[PDB]
Every structure is written in structure tokens, then in C-alpha cells.
């Protein structure tokens, strides 16, 4: 902020609407200048705002962690993981998705038998043991996957 | 709280509204506190009261790092199977019971309980499957709703007597070693006389409670995930409400 | 009510005040002790009672100097006699008289004015969309 | 402040046999072996777990074998629970592994 | 909010007038609180409005 | 009482860390004789029957916490009958035991 | 810690009870003013935390 | 250490027992004020701990 005192108070003559902001050009040639000697002119330093990004950072890792979903999804970067380190950094979500996938296929299978009773399908109904089946849900490059299926 | 040797039809209700009734009470109003823990209100070692913008900014730094730790260990605890010994199949008994009581989804509530807690029951009664024979229901039951007596805390498989309260919280059930007996419980703490205790022969032989311990110990200490770490996440908060009040108060020139 | 009696101020000065030199005496004393109340931050509900030593001292020292020198000159003449004083208090009482009337204040004089960014603040929100689902305690 | 958090999470996550990254931070690009280490207390504090939680279970089943009769299995104290692995390997090691044993 | 064992076709309106339907709106407040937080309307613990 | 709030932050179970790392690693999984690969049999099943799996943990962690534990063997019957001695730890804190040397 | 020296004393009328704390609203857009040209505000530094 | 120097010394009235400790409250919010414009308010710097 560039402040200025000991400037010529009492000026603009009682200082009126209709615009009469003479806009004073300050540009890049221009030279400000005060008659007086006493003026000073100097400007007051600004906030920093680092520490603002940083405390962002820092939040949002914190609701990455608590809500078990990767960092990368939410703030930063991936740094170049192999198989195993991105096998244990997203071990914690994976187990999550896979906790939900339990308590929703107990949801989907007791819909499911209650269509068959609808339907009839008596055999349907009182089948217990079986269970819906869920897509992967693991994060494995295809190469990976391949080769490990196609040694098995 | 001597445990009577046997419990009468008589003496249940004198015994269940002055000696279990209270202790159940008691050890309630700690599960409690310590489920509100786990769920993100951290204990406040430093109150301000009377600001109204602190209290906000406090609000704001409590984390819910306690549920974080017992949800990510109740995660990876799954049972896939149970085989008897030097054999690669199920057994079909346990199993298909394992299996009709949809254990599979209620041992996931099992572990968060014992976790949390330090302990957990599951209720073995008997009953009928859709074909008949004989199944056995298995229902989990969380510490806040139980009251297991054991005349030997470390080396005992089954309580002597156990207190239940019913997932609605309307009836109060006093189990024995071969017999329960269901009390109607209108308000809490208030047994009127004018109800009919109705005793029910359930037949198991013992208690049919089993306490999912979470840590073992010599000491009888029953440990949880949750009052364990209570000041390591209550210092955290703290740490948080600091920043938060640094950045409310001071971030700017 | 002024802090000190007009007794001691007569006993000090070594005067009577009569007539009209009683009433100004007076009213120079209530002034002071107003002052005096105004600085110390202490009202001492009974002004001649409870009042501390040294604070009527203080109060007894500025009322003198007041009544003796109101027009607070520096030099005063007349004929071949010539007197000079000190400079004059800022109001009435010396620094010293000051720090002893502020005695009274707490955390020697360090006092803190609390800070608002004007936001009201709701730490129940969150907690609104609550459901009581269980027996209910 | 951060420094500060950064330290308290992690000694929660320590003090929890928790990993590091799932509190705070992140994982630095670990080996098979330097993982197999760094995982070691969750994954022994899991194994303590499942001990514990299975002889439960087992005294579950066996009171509900009885239940229903099935003297046998009441009275079979050498069955035991089963639990999935809770290992953090990587696909194509495990494989391999399993694969040259 | 005890359940009754059976419901009556002529206890019907007055079951759904009186227990249900308050219940059901009690309920739909906090929901509709839960739903929008999750659009990006988060609480505000902080609010300094006339600005 | 404001100072004190904060000690009580600042404690922090390390030692019970300690003693939990070192719980978790130890466990028995057989009792065989001088160059066999098979359990004995009596003495196994006796371990087995006393759910020793669970109990050798906390018999474990009070011998690293006091320095020292004690396991009771007295006399007991099984199901089946014969003889089945029962093995029950003992806490430190509950058994003063005196030795001649 | 922000720090004012050389401001009127004696302020507040004898400071009271019953909440009286006017909290003076020191946003990121309000300028703080003093009348006095004597009076100096500063603040005192604080601990690294670091070490 | 915070250092005040040239406040109204003399106060609290022969300091006594008590508790008469009303611990000013210097909380982030709070502006640090003396009447007296002599009045020097600093702080006192602190060993690295890193050597």
C-alpha cells in the first residue's frame, strides 16, 4: 500500500461527486513528486500467503487420511511408486471399498432372494450361500496383472 | 458384587433393580463417553467457554483420528473359513451356521466393538432354520448393552450371569446358565411390579455369551483401540486448534 | 465526599478557612478526590473512612497546591520580594503522586483489550443433522 | 504449527501400530523387503488380533455346534477359523513366489 | 414411537397423521441438512454477515 | 490446573509400545522331540486344550512388563476323562513366589 | 503478541463486569488507529518451535 | 522471555497470598496496552538446542 504524509491537506477543494477523479497517471516513466519536503512517501509490506497454501496442504491430506481415499485423489502428486509401495498406499482404501462391498452384496443378495420368493422360485429364495460377485477394485498395471495371472 | 450362587424365580427382580441395574449403569456411562470418543468429540483438557469464535475454531480442529485407527484394524480382520485340523475343506456345521447367520457382515460390527470398547459378546441361542432341524442364531452384542459377571475374569469361557438390554431398549433379559428371564422396562431404571417376569428356557447349558477380548492380559485390563490413545489425539486436536487460532487471529500484517 | 477532611487540610497548611475560604477549600478538595478517584479507578464509598493513608496524603499535597498556587506561575514579584517556583504538574498531581494513586491497579498497569473479526461463530453446526438411532440414554 | 502436527501424527500413528502414510505424509518408494519391515508391527498387531478374535470365534462355533446337537464339533477344540491374508504384497511377487514354490 | 402390532384399515390415517408422518419429517430435516453439505454447502462454523 | 492439562497431553505410552513389539512377536507353534518333525502328542494336546495360543501372550507381556510371570500347572479331567492337567498364568501382581535359591 | 504503548489510560470507566468487552473489530480490512502520535503498536516475536 | 520495563510499579497493593494471582488473560486476540508512552515492551531470545 503506498502511503503518503505530509502531503498539502485541505486539497480537491471540498472534495465532490461527479466523478472529478482525475485519476493521477502513475505509470512506469512517470516521476511522483511533492513540493514540500517534509512528505514522505513509502509503502506498507504485504501477507506472505505461503503459509496459507501450506496449512491447505496440510487439511486436505488430513480429510485424505480420515476419509481412507488416496492423497493423490485429493491434493499434491503421485510420486513414482513401485508394485509394492502402491500395493500398501492404497491398501487402505481398497480394504474399505472391500468392506463396503461385503455390507452392500449382504444388501444385493437379500434383495435378490426376496425377487426370487416374489417370483416364485422357491429354490432361489432360501439360497443363501449364494453371494453377488464385484468388479476389482485393485489399482495393478496391466502388465503386472498379466504376467503375474499368466504365471499362475 | 458378590455373584449369588444361584438366582430364584423371586429373586430376580429385587436382584436385577439393586445389585446388575446400577453396575450396568456405571460401566454405561464410560462405554458411552468412550464411543463418543471414537466419533470424533475428543476429550477438551482446556475449556474457554464464553467466546462462542474459540469454541467454533475448537470445533473445527477435532478429527476423528480414534475411529480412523479402529476402522482401518476392523478392516483387514475377515474370517473366510473354518476347517477342522489337517483338513482342507469347511466344516459343514459350523460353517453353514457361520454362513445362515450372515456372519460374514456382523463380525465386522463384532471387531469394531471389541476394538472400541476393549471387548465384545455374541449371543449363541437356540432355534429353527427355514427347514427345521436345529440352527443356532448368532447375534453380536455390543459391551453398552451387556453386563457379563465371570467369577474369574482371565480364565473363564463363560459368564455366571449376563444383563442384557434390548436393541430397542424396552425389555431388560437376565440370563443364567440354562434359563433367562425378559423384564419389562418402560423408563430406565424403572422395573414396575404390576409386569409378569417371563422366564424362558433357552437350554445352552452355559451362558451363551462369548467376550471378544482385544488385548489379552494377566491384569484382567480389558484395553481398548480408543482410551489407550485418548491424550495423543486429544494433543493433536490441540495442536490444530493452535494453527486455527493463529491463522484466525494472527495471519495477516 | 472528599477523600481527606478539611481538618487535616487546615492542620497541614496551618490555616483556618472562614467564610467564603472554607466553601472554595471545599470544593478544591472534591475535586482533587474526584481526580483522584478518576486515576486510582478506586470510588470509595466512604470518602473520609476507608480512605488509604497515602492516597490522602496525595489528595492533601494537590489540594494545598491548588489552593496555594491555582494560576500556576513560575516567578512572582513585588516590590524587593521575589519568589520562584518549580514547573507545575500537568494536572494535579506530580509522577510520583500518579504512580502512588495507580497502585491500586492490577498486573502493574498492563491492561488488554480483546480482538473480534465480527463473525458470530457456530460451534453447534455439524452437529445439527444429528439422528438418535439405539435405546436412547 | 504444520512441523508440529506432522510430529503428533506420527506419534499416534506409531503409538496405533498404524503406517505412517495412512495418518499423515506419504510413502517413499520402499522395496519388497524395506515394505516387509515397515509394515511388520500392523501386521503382527493384526496377527494378534486374529488370534484372539478367532479363539473367540471358535468358542462361538463350538457353543453353536452344540446348540444344534453335533457333538462332534463341540467338542473339536482343534478346529480353528480361517482368516484372509492381510499381507501387503504386490500382485506379481506373491505370484512369482507362490508360483516357484 | 412403539410400534403397534397390527394396523387397522381405518387406523391407518390417524397412525400416519400422528406418529408417522412427524417422525418421517424430524428425520427429513437432518437429511436434507446431510444431503446438502454433500453439494459443497459445508456448515458454516463462522458467520459474519451485514458485509 | 492449566499447566497440568498440558503435562497430561504430553504423556504418551511408549513403554506399552515397547512391550507390545515385543508381545507380538513371540508365539509357539509346535512342541517336538530331539530330531522329529512331529509334535508330541501328549504334550500338545495339553497346549492346545488349554487355549495356550491366546494365554502364552499375556504370559508373554507380564514377563516383559515385571521382569517375570508365572504359569499354574494343576491337576485336572477333561472331557473324555483320563487326566488333563489345566495351565493357567499368573499375574506378578497376584502370586508372591519363594525360592531357596 | 501485539503491543500498544502511550495509548489514553484510564479508558473503559472503571472497566466493569457484565460482559463490556466491546471486542474491537480488527478484520483483515480494518486499519487500527490511534490519535495519540506518541503511541506505538508493535508485536514481540515468538518460539521457532524447531528445536 | 517477555520483558516489560518502566511500567507503574507499586501495584497490587503489597503484593499478597491468597491466590491474587488474576493471571491476565493474553490470549491470540488480545492487544498487550499500557498507558505509559516510556513504557518498552520486548522479548528475550531463546538457546538453538541444535548444537
Same mark, same amino acid.
Given at each position: ?5 505530509? #502531503?498539502?491537506? %485541505? ?6 461527486? &461527479?466523478?472529478?477523479?482525475?485519476? %493521477? #497517471? %502513475? ?10 519536503? &517534509?512528505?514522505? $512517501?513509502?509503502? %506498507? ?6 503459509? $496459507? ?8 491430506? #488430513? ?9 493423490? #485423489? ?24 472391500? &468392506?463396503?462391498?461385503?455390507? $452392500? ?13 416374489? &417370483? ?7 439360497? $443363501? ?24 | ?25 456405571? /460401566? ?48 483387514? =480382520? ?54 427345521? +432341524?436345529?440352527? +443356532? ?36 433379559? =437376565? ?67 493452535? /494453527? ?10 | ?37 478518576? !486515576? ?18 496525595? !489528595? ?12 500556576? !506561575? ?38 488488554? !483489550? ?24
Amino acid at each position: 500500500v503506498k502511503v503518503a504524509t505530509g #502531503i498539502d491537506d %485541505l486539497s480537491e477543494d471540498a472534495t465532490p461527486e &461527479e466523478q472529478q477523479r482525475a485519476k %493521477l #497517471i %502513475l505509470a512506469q516513466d512517470d516521476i511522483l513528486m511533492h513540493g514540500n519536503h &517534509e512528505a514522505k $512517501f513509502y509503502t %506498507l509490506p504485504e501477507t506472505s500467503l505461503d503459509g $496459507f497454501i501450506a496449512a491447505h496442504t496440510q487439511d486436505v491430506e #488430513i480429510l485424505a487420511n480420515n476419509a481412507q481415499v488416496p492423497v493423490w #485423489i485429493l491434493n499434491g502428486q503421485l510420486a513414482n511408486l513401485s508394485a509394492d509401495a502402491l500395493t500398501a498406499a492404497t491398501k487402505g482404501t481398497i480394504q474399505k471399498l472391500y &468392506e463396503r462391498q461385503v455390507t $452392500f452384496g449382504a444388501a444385493h443378495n437379500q434383495v435378490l432372494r426376496l425377487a426370487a420368493h416374489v &417370483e416364485g422360485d422357491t429354490e432361489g429364495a432360501r439360497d $443363501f450361500t449364494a453371494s453377488v460377485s464385484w468388479q476389482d477394485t485393485s489399482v495393478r498395471s496391466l502388465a503386472q496383472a498379466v504376467d503375474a495371472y499368466g504365471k499362475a | 458384587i458378590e455373584l449369588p450362587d444361584a438366582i430364584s424365580d423371586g429373586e430376580v427382580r429385587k436382584l436385577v433393580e439393586n445389585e446388575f441395574w446400577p453396575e450396568f449403569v456405571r /460401566r454405561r456411562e464410560k462405554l458411552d463417553r468412550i464411543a463418543q470418543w471414537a466419533r470424533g468429540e475428543q476429550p477438551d483438557y482446556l475449556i474457554q467457554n464464553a467466546n462462542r469464535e474459540k469454541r467454533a475454531l475448537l470445533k473445527l480442529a477435532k478429527t476423528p483420528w480414534l475411529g480412523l485407527v479402529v476402522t482401518h484394524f476392523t478392516q483387514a =480382520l475377515f474370517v473366510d473359513g473354518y476347517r477342522a485340523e489337517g483338513s482342507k475343506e469347511n466344516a459343514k456345521g459350523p460353517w453353514q451356521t457361520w454362513n445362515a447367520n450372515k456372519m460374514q457382515s456382523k463380525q465386522i460390527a463384532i471387531h469394531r466393538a471389541a476394538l472400541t470398547y476393549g471387548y465384545s459378546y455374541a449371543r449363541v441361542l437356540p432355534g429353527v432354520a427355514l427347514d427345521g +432341524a436345529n440352527q +443356532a442364531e448368532i447375534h453380536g452384542v455390543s459391551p453398552r448393552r451387556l453386563l457379563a459377571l465371570y467369577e474369574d475374569q482371565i480364565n473363564d469361557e463363560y459368564p455366571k450371569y449376563a444383563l442384557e438390554l434390548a436393541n430397542n431398549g424396552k425389555t431388560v433379559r =437376565l440370563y443364567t446358565d440354562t434359563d433367562y428371564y425378559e423384564l419389562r422396562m418402560p423408563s430406565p431404571g424403572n422395573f414396575p411390579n404390576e409386569q409378569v417376569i417371563k422366564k424362558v428356557h433357552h437350554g445352552v447349558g452355559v451362558c451363551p455369551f462369548v467376550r471378544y477380548v482385544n488385548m489379552m492380559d494377566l491384569d484382567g485390563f480389558t484395553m481398548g483401540e480408543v482410551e489407550y490413545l485418548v491424550p495423543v489425539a486429544s494433543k493433536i486436536d490441540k495442536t490444530d486448534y493452535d /494453527r486455527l487460532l493463529a491463522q484466525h487471529y494472527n495471519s495477516w500484517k | 465526599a472528599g477523600l481527606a477532611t478539611i481538618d487535616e487540610l487546615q492542620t497541614l497548611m496551618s490555616t483556618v478557612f472562614e467564610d467564603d475560604a472554607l466553601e472554595q477549600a471545599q470544593l478544591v478538595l472534591d475535586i482533587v478526590s474526584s481526580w483522584a478517584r478518576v !486515576v486510582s479507578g478506586q470510588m470509595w464509598p466512604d470518602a473520609p473512612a476507608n480512605v488509604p493513608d497515602d492516597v490522602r496524603a496525595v !489528595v492533601l499535597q494537590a489540594s494545598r497546591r491548588e489552593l496555594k498556587n491555582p494560576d500556576r !506561575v513560575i516567578s512572582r514579584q513585588m516590590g524587593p520580594f521575589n519568589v520562584q517556583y518549580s514547573q507545575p504538574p500537568d494536572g494535579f498531581f506530580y509522577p510520583a503522586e500518579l504512580a502512588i494513586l495507580k497502585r491500586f491497579k492490577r498486573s502493574g498497569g498492563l491492561m488488554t !483489550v480483546s480482538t473480534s473479526r465480527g463473525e458470530e461463530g457456530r460451534p453447534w453446526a455439524g452437529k445439527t443433522a444429528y439422528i438418535r438411532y439405539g435405546d436412547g440414554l
